Amino acid sequence: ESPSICEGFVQASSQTLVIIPDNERITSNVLTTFEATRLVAVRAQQLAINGSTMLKKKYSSPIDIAKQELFNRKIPLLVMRCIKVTPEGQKIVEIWNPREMGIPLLD
Amino acid sequence: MAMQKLFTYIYEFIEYRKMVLLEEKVPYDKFVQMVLNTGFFRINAETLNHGIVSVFIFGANGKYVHHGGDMRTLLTNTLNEKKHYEELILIVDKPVLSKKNILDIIVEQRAANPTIVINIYPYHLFCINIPKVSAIPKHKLITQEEAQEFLGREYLQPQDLMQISASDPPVVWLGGRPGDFVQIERPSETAMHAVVIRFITKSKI
Amino acid sequence: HDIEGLKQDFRLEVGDILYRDVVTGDVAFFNRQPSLERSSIGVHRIVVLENPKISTFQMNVSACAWYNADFDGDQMNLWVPWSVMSRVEAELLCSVR
Amino acid sequence: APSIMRRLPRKEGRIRKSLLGSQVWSISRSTICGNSDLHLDEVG
Amino acid sequence: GEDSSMDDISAYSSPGLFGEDIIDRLDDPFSIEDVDISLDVLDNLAPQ
Ligand SMILES: [Mg+2]
Numbered sequence: 001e002s003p004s005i006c007e008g009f010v011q012a013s014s015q016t017l018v019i020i021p022d023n024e025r026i027t028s029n030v031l032t033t034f035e036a037t038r039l040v041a042v043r044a045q046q047l048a049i050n051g052s053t054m055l056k057k058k059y060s061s062p063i064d065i066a067k068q069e070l071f072n073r074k075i076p077l078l079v080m081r082c083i084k085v086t087p088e089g090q091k092i093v094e095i096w097n098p099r100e101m102g103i104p105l106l107d
Numbered sequence: 108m109a110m111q112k113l114f115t116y117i118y119e120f121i122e123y124r125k126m127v128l129l130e131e132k133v134p135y136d137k138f139v140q141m142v143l144n145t146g147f148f149r150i151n152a153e154t155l156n157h158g159i160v161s162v163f164i165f166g167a168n169g170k171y172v173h174h175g176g177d178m179r180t181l182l183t184n185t186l187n188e189k190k191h192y193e194e195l196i197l198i199v200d201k202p203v204l205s206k207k208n209i210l211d212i213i214v215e216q217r218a219a220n221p222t223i224v225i226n227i228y229p230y231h232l233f234c235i236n237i238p239k240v241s242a243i244p245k246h247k248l249i250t251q252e253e254a255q256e257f258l259g260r261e262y263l264q265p266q267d268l269m270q271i272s273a274s275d276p277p278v279v280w281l282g283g284r285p286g287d288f289v290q291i292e293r294p295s296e297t298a299m300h301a302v303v304i305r306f307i308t309k310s311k312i
Numbered sequence: 313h314d315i316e317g318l319k320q321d322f323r324l325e326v327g328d329i330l331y332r333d334v335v336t337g338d339v340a341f342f343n344r345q346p347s348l349e350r351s352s353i354g355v356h357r358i359v360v361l362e363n364p365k366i367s368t369f370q371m372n373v374s375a376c377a378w379y380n381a382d383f384d385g386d387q388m389n390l391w392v393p394w395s396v397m398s399r400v401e402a403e404l405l406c407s408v409r
Numbered sequence: 410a411p412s413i414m415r416r417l418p419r420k421e422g423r424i425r426k427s428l429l430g431s432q433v434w435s436i437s438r439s440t441i442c443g444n445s446d447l448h449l450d451e452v453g
Numbered sequence: 454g455e456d457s458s459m460d461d462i463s464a465y466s467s468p469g470l471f472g473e474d475i476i477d478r479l480d481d482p483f484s485i486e487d488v489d490i491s492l493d494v495l496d497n498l499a500p501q
Contacts, residue, residue, distance in 0.1 A: 033404070033405060036404070040400045041401055041404075044396045051326065062396060063396065063400050067400075067404075084262050344497055345489070345490045345494050345497060346489065355450075357448070358451075359451045359452065359453050366453075368439055369440065369452060369453060370442055370443070370453025371441055371442075371452050372445065372447045372449045372451070373445065381497070384499060385499065386441050386496060386497045387440050387493060387496060387497065388438070389438045389494075390436070390439070391435055419486075
């Protein structure tokens with residue numbers, strides 16, 4: 001009996017974001033090439049949809065502007081890294097800063 | 108010639124487990140004839156926990172490895188002895204492990220006696236100094252507190268770690284109960300030896 | 313809108329999307345099947361051969377080791393990333409260097 | 410006739426053809442050929 | 454005894470192969486069933 005829904009606790013309990021203190025993070029302080037590439041791609045798409053920038057040197061493509069923002073440490077994004085899914089509905093992340101963190105080769 | 112090798116390496120295993128003997132050591136001849144006639148050689152060991160561990164070296168084709176009534180009688184009467192009896196160990200021939208009725212009596216007495224742990228091992232576990240084998244890296248049991256510290260630093264529940272059966276020869280020689288952690292120093296062609304921590308699960312039947 | 317029906321538009325607003333041709337310098341994925349190796353798909357900078365009589369994909373010979381290819385008649389798929397995200401990723405992550 | 414379940418398995422099935430792979434737009438295929446005057450990271 | 458009307462035409466197509474009744478189920482070790490290549494791209498699998 002029952003249509004697989006009435007007893008179905010399908011709605012997962014909402015999670016609370018716990019941010020690990022800045023002195024407790026144990027992940028690399030250097031952007032992995034995946035993370036740097038994702039940051040550049042997100043920033044460049046957002047410049048395509050919006051167009052605003054903090055650069056002084058004006059470029060003719062959002063890719064170049066986002067790449068320089070990552071290189072010149074003005075990209076307005078925060079890489080958050082998540083390490084847990086606790087049964088207590090408590091997602092454990094540590095929010096890193098791409099401006100403070102090192103930058104891989106990418107070239 | 109598994110009898111002589113088993114006879115020397117069981118005592119080496121008792122020494123490896125950091126246990127003391129409650130009796131005097133008979134020689135090879137008395138051991139083998141008593142095994143052949145009685146059907147088992149019983150060895151008592153005392154641990155630092157002041158618990159008692161008994162080992163039963165069953166015969167290859169004796170009276171005790173074929174019929175469940177006698178095996179049941181042995182377990183019932185030996186487990187009511189007033190020793191602390193931390194762990195009981197049965198060392199039997201390899202083909203005996205497939206024989207069902209012995210496994211049934213083993214599990215029945217395990218369920219009947221909760222606090223006592225019973226394990227039945229084949230001969231090949233105690234026919235060689237297992238920790239001294241070249242191919243076997245160095246296993247060591249980390250305490251619960253340091254394992255918990257390692258897990259909490261790693262944000263890992265114990266079930267996340269790689270599993271190792273409690274019947275693994277190095278773990279058996281170490282004396283690893285299920286639910287405990289074993290740290291391993293495995294040689295590596297890449298990093299020149301590396302350390303892993305494995306979770307001990309329930310043994311084989 | 314098609315570009316041949318826009319004789320009177322002449323205006324591209326901010327936020328308009330234009331689909332321009334692939335020019336020399338653009339990045340493009342270059343793949344030979346079967347894709348056994350990690351290098352079987354890589355990104356090459358486009359060199360547009362403006363000779364209309366040429367229809368083959370041209371690669372440096374030393375670049376064949378990436379795809380285990382030869383020129384005995386092999387065919388390789390090529391697609392140009394058009395989205396900003398895929399272009400960034402292609403030049404920063406999948407470049408043959 | 411091919412039923413619902415026959416659509417799933419095998420290479421040409423739903424999974425191994427439509428899900429694990431896909432057909433795409435904006436992709437071109439052609440015969441490769443050598444070009445000694447192209448950089449290793451360049452395609453003609 | 455001479456019923457050419459109801460005759461198993463499945464045997465009219467003569468069994469010109471030795472092992473026909475036997476059935477092989479394992480994957481044929483010559484097929485592209487588990488490999489993924491398209492037509493005119495199978496030329497890349499040519500010699501060399
Ligand atoms: Mg070829």
